[PDB]
Write a structure and sequence with these properties.
By secondary structure, this protein is mainly α. The protein has 1 helix and no strands. One of its GO terms (biological process) is killing of cells of another organism.
């Protein structure tokens, strides 16, 4: 959806590898995953 534009980036901490820890910096991406 055009609503979740404030965080079109996407949810990805990367803490599941390099170990940067919940490095999302914009979970808004979820707003787009649905619309």
């Amino acid at each position: 959806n055009k609503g979740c534009a404030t965080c079109s980036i996407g949810a990805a901490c990367l803490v599941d590898g390099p170990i940067p820890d919940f490095e999302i910096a914009g979970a808004x991406g979820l707003x787009g995953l649905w619309g």
